[PDB]
Design a binder for this molecule. Structure first.
Ligand SMILES: [Mg+2]
Ligand SMILES: [Mg+2]
Ligand SMILES: [Mg+2]
Ligand SMILES: [Mg+2]
Ligand SMILES: [Mg+2]
Ligand SMILES: [Mg+2]
Ligand SMILES: [Mg+2]
Ligand SMILES: [Mg+2]
Ligand SMILES: [Mg+2]
Ligand SMILES: [Mg+2]
Ligand SMILES: [Mg+2]
Ligand SMILES: [Mg+2]
Ligand SMILES: [Mg+2]
Ligand SMILES: [Mg+2]
Ligand SMILES: [Mg+2]
Ligand SMILES: [Mg+2]
Ligand SMILES: [Mg+2]
Ligand SMILES: [Mg+2]
Ligand SMILES: [Mg+2]
Ligand SMILES: [Mg+2]
Ligand SMILES: [Mg+2]
Ligand SMILES: [Mg+2]
Ligand SMILES: [Mg+2]
Ligand SMILES: [Mg+2]
Ligand SMILES: [Mg+2]
Ligand SMILES: [Mg+2]
Ligand SMILES: [Mg+2]
Ligand SMILES: [Mg+2]
Ligand SMILES: [Mg+2]
Ligand SMILES: [Mg+2]
Ligand SMILES: [Mg+2]
Ligand SMILES: [Mg+2]
Ligand SMILES: [Mg+2]
Lengths: 579, 51, 183, 109, 62
RNA sequence: CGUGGAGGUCAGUGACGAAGCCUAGACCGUAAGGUCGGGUCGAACGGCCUCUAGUGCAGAUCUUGGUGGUAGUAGCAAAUAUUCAAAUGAGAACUUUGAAGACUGAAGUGGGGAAAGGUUCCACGUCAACAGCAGUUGGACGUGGGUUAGUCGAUCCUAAGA
RNA sequence: GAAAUUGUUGAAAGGGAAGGGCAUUUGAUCAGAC
């Protein structure tokens, strides 16, 4: 049928989201294939920097292609005939200190980036370059779908100087910044929620000073914890984080813009940062506009974070970005700032002028194209699934079995032809770009002096349903992203922050799904090879005497045993080197 | 997909462009009533029947 | 607001006012007075009928030169019409009135239209063209309307008889004689 | 109430168009048919199958035929309530001569 | 929908009079989306649009 | 008798309402006019003694502005002609499409230009005002796109002339 | 925010104009009084 009906809404959404064996093996191939990916990048990363000189330092644009084209290597070999949709979920995005995410440069642009920032520099000298300097917090985000099922990898690798005084290649010294306080806060919190999602399968071995038997896991439980880990480490939980439930051809990030009925998850926005500061005075007055936008199934898609309660037979994503705080006297709001392609906006030496390297196709928007180049891109972008891509993936030569300079040239000549079909699509809004954002801290005392004539609440943002419209909530009434930039753009009070982003996928299985085990926790992108911390020393950590903290140490070593009723598997990577 | 979009509307635009057509119409009628009198001024007219 | 003066109790009445509408002032004023004082449910059906030419609007003031019809006999006048456009706006103000009434909590079958008035909007001005190359004003007589519906109160019967009686000294002794006679 | 009919009427157009303006003659027939069918089955909502149109105009504005054989159907109105639940539909019947034919109920099946 | 333009381009692409252009009444939503010549091209060969036959002037009588 | 301004005076009146305006409410004066109450209004004004003048209106086929009666009347009639369905639509005599009927009938109601127009061409949006009925359409309104010459013109030559 | 002019309500009146004058009737409406 052309009509999408209630018969099939049931056949598509609940069915393919049934946990069955045919389904799990698709996820299992993704767990390794993705970890087989990070293990490859990780390899290439240190080969260039940590050890001896291999005759070129790879660049970030360099490592992106090799990474991606490797993740094509592994989808050639699996479900080749069996499955129609197999591809890259999120493109390799290598990020640096102040960058939240969204950074996926094509090869073409290292002379473009270089050019634009030629004048304004010295903060970002790593990003523009592509060469990575020491003492950086570097995310690597990968994801892959097989048959529309997504496994995502995110990890924060710190790079070190190189000490050859020890023949053993020792990364001299620990990481002594408040920087490292972030990555060990996320590394801690990652294990934190890892052990929490085990207790919703059965209320067995669940921390007593916390939940009881009344709630295996609640909307409030997980949220109370992570902000505890934060306030513990004084690391601001980023406004971009979430804990998500996933489906076939439905994942959290795929479309942040397009709406989802029957929404399941924990959400974190700036509308939540006032509630924590505003828990001092308990005033319940909500000043509300009656607008009927995102009205359809508002109940399900409003993203209630209290009503989420963990189930078994669900696939979850844990997404955590924790912004460190260099000491900030007056309390402030943690926000994200967006990076543009136009130099003129700014005379500030600290700005980044760059280009978005990720894209998305909205099947909602239909516009007839007059150009013949932007048409060949359109019917091609539709020859791929519902997930974000860059213009390189679309081509004949992109996997490029034998990598030559002749092939590096084959793609560059194509990128330009696809640049031109990209203009005509991006202006007609048939496709949305991925926001490239920075970590931005703001003083509370700018926003409370705020004087505004009111204005546009109009929908320009990738932000999700409810929270975005006013951004800073109603109790701050009068503020939208626009007046927020204005505030954020009085700059003596502005500052930016390092970030540690961590992505784990967790598949809850009962004893019907996992036989040999009894009820289990499957960690995809959790492999012992991928989750390695880096040398870190921070004086904050581990606040005792809070009933929620003492319950995490109880639960921290609880998942540490094989008498633990829920056995936590870690998918091991694949074998890389073959020749 | 639950996102339901008909709406695009701005009162500021409609209302404030409303006065505009309403002001200038007031000025066009006013250029009419100034000249209404002698609009029919016809020097060097030839009566057909009069002597 | 500030309507034309009302003898109504404001709490029990509803009100609707359009303005600067495009309509014959001379025609809409007529259609008004046809329905003035009526019950609402009534007049509504009536205007409907007129729109089909079952009833008409007697033209009681600006009548001059019109054609005389049978349907006039009803109101006992020979001059009447079916001002189709004039009605659309009255129904409009009637339709609305019914609605503003129900949000105040007033009974829909106890409603009637007490107060209906139409005065003149600023005339609007075009150009027109005549023989010998002259020019004349070409205009409309746009019309203000307001409609105040009342909740029928028949509950008023009040006893007012005020006698401060000055009777003369003669007049007193002469009543005293009628009541001495064992009236 | 009223029930859902069909019939076949011959109409005398010759008499109804008598002495009309040659230029407006045909267009009358259009009105004289809609009026005629609001007579029988006083439905008041009458529609004309464009074939019938080609029948009324086949001879030109001045040349309308003397007699038509017309299939008229009373049917129910849909959605969007019109003042009437009920319908009227006139369309042609292809026939040698309109002459000497009697009104007939065509039994629907 | 307003199909004037589509009928104009039809006469130009087909290269025949607006008299002789047929637009499928049932296709009125699809023809709407034409808006350019090369699109009309597709529609013309597709058969949603058609160049109507020349009316006849017969010389047999003469 | 009154009016616009000046010198003087009532240590005059006034945001607890000044001036103005409305008033089949009162009062003095033959009258010109003064005086009070009510309503409306929101910032300056009045009495006496004197000075001054662009100092008093029913008119002038008076000057500009404003409005009736006439009157929902005159009229909206040349160019042979329109009709049925569907679509769109808060709404269709008039828009779009199909169908049928007709007209210009090659000295055309066709296809191109000069003079003049200056964006009226085209498209997306749109219906307050304009298209002497309508309006979902437009030579209207709002946002934009559109004119590519070694060979077509100007340019050069000379004509009556300047 | 005046007048002309106009709508609504109130009152009043009217056999080919209306309007004024002297005078009192009937209807309204107000001062003086101590
Ligand atoms: Mg005059
Ligand atoms: Mg007369
Ligand atoms: Mg007459
Ligand atoms: Mg004229
Ligand atoms: Mg002339
Ligand atoms: Mg005759
Ligand atoms: Mg005086
Ligand atoms: Mg003066
Ligand atoms: Mg005053
Ligand atoms: Mg008076
Ligand atoms: Mg003078
Ligand atoms: Mg004067
Ligand atoms: Mg005068
Ligand atoms: Mg005069
Ligand atoms: Mg006049
Ligand atoms: Mg007339
Ligand atoms: Mg006319
Ligand atoms: Mg005439
Ligand atoms: Mg004519
Ligand atoms: Mg017409
Ligand atoms: Mg002819
Ligand atoms: Mg002829
Ligand atoms: Mg022409
Ligand atoms: Mg031309
Ligand atoms: Mg045009
Ligand atoms: Mg248009
Ligand atoms: Mg008009
Ligand atoms: Mg109009
Ligand atoms: Mg224009
Ligand atoms: Mg050449
Ligand atoms: Mg030449
Ligand atoms: Mg005013
Ligand atoms: Mg007056």
């Amino acid at each position: 049928a052309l009509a999408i009906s209630h018969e099939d809404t049931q056949i598509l959404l609940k069915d393919k989201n049934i946990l069955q064996e045919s389904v799990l093996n698709k996820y299992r191939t993704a767990g390794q294939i993705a970890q087989t990916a990070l293990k490859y990048v990780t390899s290439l990363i240190n080969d260039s920097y940590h050890s001896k000189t291999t005759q070129r330092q790879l660049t970030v644009p360099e490592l992106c292609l090799l990474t991606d084209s490797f993740i094509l290597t592994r989808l050639e070999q699996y479900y080749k005939n069996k499955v129609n949709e197999r591809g890259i979920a999120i493109p390799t995005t290598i990020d640096i200190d102040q960058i939240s995410g969204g950074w996926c440069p094509e090869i073409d642009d290292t002379q473009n980036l270089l050019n634009w920032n030629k004048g304004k520099d010295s903060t970002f000298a790593s990003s523009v370059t592509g060469t990575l300097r020491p003492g950086d917090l570097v995310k690597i985000t990968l994801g892959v779908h097989i048959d529309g099922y997504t496994s995502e990898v995110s990890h924060t690798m710190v790079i070190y100087p190189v000490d050859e005084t020890k023949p053993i290649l020792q990364p001299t010294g620990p990481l002594l910044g408040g920087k490292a306080d972030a990555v060990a806060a996320a590394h801690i919190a990652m294990e934190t929620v890892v052990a929490l999602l085990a207790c919703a399968l059965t209320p067995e071995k669940l921390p007593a000073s916390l939940g009881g038997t009344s709630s295996g896991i609640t909307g409030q439980l997980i949220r109370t914890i992570v902000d505890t880990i934060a306030r513990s480490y004084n690391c601001g939980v980023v406004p971009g984080s979430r804990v998500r439930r996933i489906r076939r051809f439905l994942a959290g990030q795929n479309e942040g813009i397009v709406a989802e009925r029957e929404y399941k998850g924990v959400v974190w926005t700036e509308s939540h940062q006032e509630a924590d500061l505003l828990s001092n005075t308990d005033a319940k007055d909500l000043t509300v506009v009656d607008r009927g936008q995102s009205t359809p199934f508002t109940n399900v898609s409003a993203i209630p974070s209290d009503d989420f309660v963990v189930q078994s037979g669900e696939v979850y994503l844990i997404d955590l970005k924790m912004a460190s705080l260099e000491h900030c006297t007056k309390k402030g709001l943690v926000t994200l700032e967006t990076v543009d392609s136009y130099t003129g906006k700014s005379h500030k030496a600290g700005e980044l002028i760059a280009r978005p390297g990720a894209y998305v196709r909205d099947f909602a928007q239909t516009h007839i194209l007059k150009l013949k180049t932007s048409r060949q891109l359109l019917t091609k972008i539709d020859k791929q699934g519902v997930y974000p891509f860059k213009l390189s993936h679309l081509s004949s030569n992109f996997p490029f079995v034998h990598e030559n300079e002749e092939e590096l040239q084959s793609l560059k000549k194509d990128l330009k032809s696809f640049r031109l079909g990209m203009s005509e699509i991006s202006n007609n809004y048939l496709c949305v770009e991925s926001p490239i954002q920075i970590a931005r801290w703001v003083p509370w005392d700018h926003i409370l002096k705020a004087t505004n004539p009111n204005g546009n609440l109009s929908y320009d943002a990738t932000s999700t349903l409810t929270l975005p419209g006013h951004e800073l909530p109603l109790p701050k009434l009068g503020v939208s992203a626009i007046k927020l930039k204005s505030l954020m753009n009085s700059t003596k009070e502005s500052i930016s922050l390092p970030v540690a982003r961590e992505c784990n996928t967790i598949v809850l299985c009962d004893s019907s799904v996992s036989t040999t085990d009894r009820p289990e926790l499957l960690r995809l992108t959790g492999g012992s090879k991928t989750c390695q911390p880096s040398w870190i020393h921070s004086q904050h950590e581990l606040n005792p005497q809070d009933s929620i903290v003492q319950g995490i140490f109880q639960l921290a070593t609880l998942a540490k045993d094989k008498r633990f009723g829920l056995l936590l598997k870690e998918t091991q990577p694949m074998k890389q080197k073959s020749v | 997909e639950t996102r339901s979009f008909l709406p695009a509307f701005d009162k500021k635009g409609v209302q404030t462009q409303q006065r505009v057509w309403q002001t200038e119409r007031f000025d066009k009628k006013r250029l009419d009533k100034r000249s209404a009198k002698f609009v029919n001024n016809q020097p060097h007219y030839r009566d057909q029947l009069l002597q | 607001a500030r309507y034309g003066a009302t003898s109504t109790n404001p709490a029990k009445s509803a009100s609707a006012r359009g303005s600067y509408l495009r309509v014959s002032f001379k025609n809409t004023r007529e259609t008004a007075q046809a329905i003035n004082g009526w019950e609402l449910t009534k007049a509504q059906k009536y205007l409907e009928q007129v729109l089909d030419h079952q009833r008409a609007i007697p033209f009681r003031r600006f009548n001059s030169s019109i054609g005389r019809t049978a349907q006039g006999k009803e109101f006992g006048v020979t001059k009447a019409r079916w001002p189709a456009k004039s009605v659309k706006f009255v129904q409009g103000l009637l339709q609305n009135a019914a609605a503003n009434a129900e949000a105040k909590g007033l009974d829909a079958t106890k409603l009637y239209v007490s107060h209906i008035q139409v005065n003149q909007a600023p005339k609007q001005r075009r150009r027109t063209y005549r023989a010998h190359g002259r020019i004349n004003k070409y205009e409309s007589s746009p019309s203000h309307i307001e409609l105040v519906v009342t909740e029928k109160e028949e509950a008023v019967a009040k006893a007012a008889e005020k006698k401060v009686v000055r009777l003369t000294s003669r007049q007193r002794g002469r009543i005293a004689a009628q009541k001495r006679i064992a009236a | 109430l009223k029930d859902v009919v069909t019939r076949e009427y011959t109409i005398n157009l010759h008499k109804r168009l008598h002495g009309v303006s040659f230029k407006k003659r045909a267009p009358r027939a259009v009105k004289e048919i809609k009026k005629f069918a609001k007579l029988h089955m006083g439905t008041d909502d009458v529609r004309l199958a464009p074939e019938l149109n080609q029948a009324i105009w086949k001879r030109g504005v001045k040349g309308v035929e003397y007699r038509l054989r017309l299939r008229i159907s009373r049917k129910r109105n849909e959605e969007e309530d019109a003042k009437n639940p009920l319908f009227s539909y006139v369309e042609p019947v292809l026939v040698a001569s309109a002459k000497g034919l009697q009104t007939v109920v065509v039994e629907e099946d | 929908a307003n199909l004037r333009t589509q009928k104009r381009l039809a006469a130009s692409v087909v290269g025949v009079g607006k008299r002789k252009v047929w637009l499928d009444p049932n296709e009125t939503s699809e023809i709407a989306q034409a808006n350019s010549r090369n699109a009309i091209r597709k529609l013309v060969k597709n058969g949603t649009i058609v160049k109507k036959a020349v009316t006849v002037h017969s010389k047999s009588r003469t």
